[PDB]
Design a protein around this ligand. Structure first.
Ligand SMILES: *O[C@H]1CCO[C@@H]1COP(=O)(O)O
Length: 297
DNA sequence: CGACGGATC
DNA sequence: GCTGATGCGC
DNA sequence: GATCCGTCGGGCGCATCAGC
């Protein structure tokens, strides 16, 4: 009730399944002398909105969880609004990279804020440049790549399901795999798919809802996992029900009636270096909550 | 997106 | 130029 | 017993506009 995630919420669960509790299921902090990267990812549902929330201060988050790189989705920013925010950004993180939808305005929008100068930063899939909907940001680091994405929602009526499955999902795969040729890859963001029924509260009701269509779930396996990539949370907390998105319509958060739509998918070659893929259901301000990764470098 | 029939499988 | 209302995808 | 379909309906951030 003050921690409603700790309660298991599911329409057709299984007895083995236990609800994720970060305070008990998270490994202890890593040893002092460990080359680690700590990333965080959050679909803020409007960056401007979020900065104007209860008492939100990015600085607090970066103090609370001491993240090295922050990945944001659905900034809802225009390329005009970037310079202002880029200053107000978390102080101490001065290398920030932003991508905004230029078509539908105040929609979509990705961003990577880091205190580690990347070796390079490119937007969109390949040298095609910024995605029109500002949905892809890719950053090269010394040992790996980090792709932040806000996958296009197939929409109500699934009127974008064909674009999603036949175009987006494919190109995102091809982008990732081309990169893996050189350095390993870490994909994160709002992938907009609950892979399994453990990743959703009402699997049956949402069989034709965007996010849980068999088509989208197959593509997740086919275009991504079955092509060399690992769901960091799922490998670490098998049979644990943790959600990353709760709707506003019915206060799903107060009832943990949630989906898991945000991931940290990593290449197999690096899956052992994963220390903790986690979820922070406590941090409000968005219909999504933050998720984090601690990767031994 | 959850939740609710009634009709359908 | 400012606000409440509207519209639309999430 | 389940799935299906058709419906509602105290949601939200942002852009745009009417009407001051
Ligand atoms: O219906 C919800 C759950 C699956 O997709 C929408 C959420 O959209 P995102 O904010 O995840 O794009």
């Amino acid at each position: 009730q003050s921690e409603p995630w700790t309660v298991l919420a599911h329409k057709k669960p299984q007895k083995d399944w236990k609800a994720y509790n970060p305070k008990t299921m998270r490994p202890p902090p890593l040893p002092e002398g460990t080359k680690c990267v700590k990333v965080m990812t959050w679909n803020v549902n409007g960056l401007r909105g979020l900065l104007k929330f209860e008492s939100f201060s990015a600085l607090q988050l970066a103090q609370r969880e001491n993240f090295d790189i922050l990945c944001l989705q659905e900034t809802k920013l225009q390329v005009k609004d970037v310079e202002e925010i880029k200053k107000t950004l978390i102080d101490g993180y001065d290398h920030s990279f932003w991508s905004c939808s230029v078509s539908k305005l105040g929609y979509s929008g990705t961003a990577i804020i880091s205190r580690i100068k990347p070796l390079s930063v490119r937007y969109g899939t390949g040298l095609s440049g910024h995605d029109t909907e500002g949905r892809i940001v890719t950053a090269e680091f010394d040992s790996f790549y980090l792709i932040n994405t806000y996958v296009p929602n197939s929409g109500d009526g699934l009127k974008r399901l064909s674009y999603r499955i036949e175009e987006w999902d494919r190109t995102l795969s091809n982008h990732i795999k081309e990169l893996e040729k050189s350095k390993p890859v870490v994909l994160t963001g709002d992938l907009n798919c609950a892979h399994e029924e453990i990743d959703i509260f009402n699997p049956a009701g949402n069989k034709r809802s965007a996010g849980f269509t068999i088509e989208e779930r197959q593509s997740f396996g086919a275009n991504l996992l079955d092509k060399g990539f690992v769901d960091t949370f799922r490998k670490q907390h098998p049979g644990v029900v943790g959600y990353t998105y709760w709707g506003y319509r019915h206060g799903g958060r107060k009832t943990n009636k949630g989906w898991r739509l945000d991931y940290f998918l990593v290449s197999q070659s690096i899956a052992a270096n994963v220390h903790d893929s986690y979820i922070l259901p406590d941090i409000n301000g968005s219909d999504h909550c933050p998720i984090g990764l601690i990767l031994k470098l």
